[PDB]
Amino acid sequence: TMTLNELLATNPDGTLEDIAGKYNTSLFAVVEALPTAQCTLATGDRFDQVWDTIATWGEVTLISHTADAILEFKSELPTGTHRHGYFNLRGKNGLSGHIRATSCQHIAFIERKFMGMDTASVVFFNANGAAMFKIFLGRDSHRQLLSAQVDAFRALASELQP
Amino acid sequence: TMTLNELLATNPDGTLEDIAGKYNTSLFAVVEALPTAQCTLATGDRFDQVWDTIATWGEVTLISHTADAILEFKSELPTGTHRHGYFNLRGKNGLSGHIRATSCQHIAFIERKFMGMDTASVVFFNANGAAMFKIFLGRDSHRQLLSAQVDAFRALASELQ
């Protein structure tokens, strides 16, 4: 039987969600098993540092991904303030909301191919190992990932490492 | 102490999610106990009619609401196409995605208050009674429910039931 670790090393290009299902485990379990060349993990405790930074990267795509609905929204990440246990967003581009402070337990910076194209995402996980939401970098006129975002993304991932 | 039904009768103005939490049940169970004056129910098979009707109301707020986060996307609803087991949305105003419309078993039209402020929403439910997503009506310069949408809201609800 092919192990989760062996499967991920073959670099599958489908959704990690389907791999989690194939192995009857959480999305975090799958991400935690990715080759380190494709993934850098951080604790949920760095949430504010991470969010504030991405909020300076220009337009990104925030996605809510569940079995019943995948919702995607392209815009500059709004900044926010904490109050009553929630991180409240103040958006001016169509994206707003409230993120529960104690919910994020893990953060992952993933660089992998999807449908044959290079992708870079920051995934926020709750205690159950499910993705609360994901943030994907945008592309340029060459259909390549925005170089300025890739550099900031890798820089942030790096400083979150010991 | 109060039962779910007793509480709902006093017209609470917090989130229905908080109430589902207190009574450790599903959001749908809570909506089912709402007074008919505040809630109109429909089945999942009315999904297309509802989505296409709302997609002509102008800007609305599509919301993903879970125990960990409330994400709100303001825009006019994009056009949806059924294909590969999903209702796929086209890119517009920044909102896109894929919805498992068939998984929708119930649709609720709720008119209630949240923190002294009137709200009108359309909730789409899972078989498990969870909200797949919600749609809240838009508001004026100084935040009033668009009467144009409220009128169309109440009309679509009655038309369905």
In short:
With 162 residues, chain A is an alpha+beta fold. Helices cover 25% and strands 36% of the residues of chain A. Chain A contains five helices and nine strands; from the N terminus they run H-H-H-E-H-E-E-E-E-E-E-E-E-H.
Structural account:
Two copies of one chain form a homodimer. With 162 residues, chain A is α+β, with helices and mostly antiparallel strands. Chain A has a single domain (1-162), classed as Heme iron utilization protein-like fold (3-Layer(aba) Sandwich), CATH 3.40.1570. Chain A is 25% helix and 36% strand. Chain A contains five helices and nine strands. In chain A, strands 1-7-8-9-2-3 form a six-stranded antiparallel sheet. Chain A has a three-stranded antiparallel sheet with strand order 4-5-6, with no helix packed on it. In chain A, strand 2 (59-65) and strand 3 (69-76) form a beta hairpin. Strand 3 (69-76) of chain A pairs antiparallel with strand 6 (95-99) of chain B. Chain B: It comes from Pectobacterium atrosepticum (strain SCRI 1043 / ATCC BAA-672).
Beta-strand fraction estimate of chain A: 35-45%
The biggest sheet of chain A amounts to: 6 strands, antiparallel
| Strand count of chain A | 9
CATH class of chain A: Alpha Beta
Helix share bin of chain A: 10-25%
Rough outline of chain A: globular
Q: Pairing-aware structural class of the strands and helices of chain A?
A: alpha+beta
CATH architecture of chain A: 3-Layer(aba) Sandwich
Order of helices and strands of chain A: HHHEHEEEEEEEEH
In DSSP terms (H or I, runs of 4 or more residues), the helix count of chain A works out at 5
- In CATH, the homologous superfamily of chain A goes by the name HemS/ChuS/ChuX like domains
Radius of gyration of chain A: 15 Å
Oligomer: homodimer
Terminal residue distance of chain A: 35 Å
Largest inter-chain interface? A-B, 26 and 26 residues
In CATH, the topology of chain A is named Heme iron utilization protein-like fold
Spatial strand arrangement across the major sheet of chain A: 1-7-8-9-2-3
Integer count of domains of chain A: 1
Pfam families (chain B): ChuX_HutX
Organism (chain B): Pectobacterium atrosepticum (strain SCRI 1043 / ATCC BAA-672) (Erwinia carotovora subsp. atroseptica)
Protein name (chain B): Heme utilization cystosolic carrier protein HutX
PDB class: structural genomics, unknown function
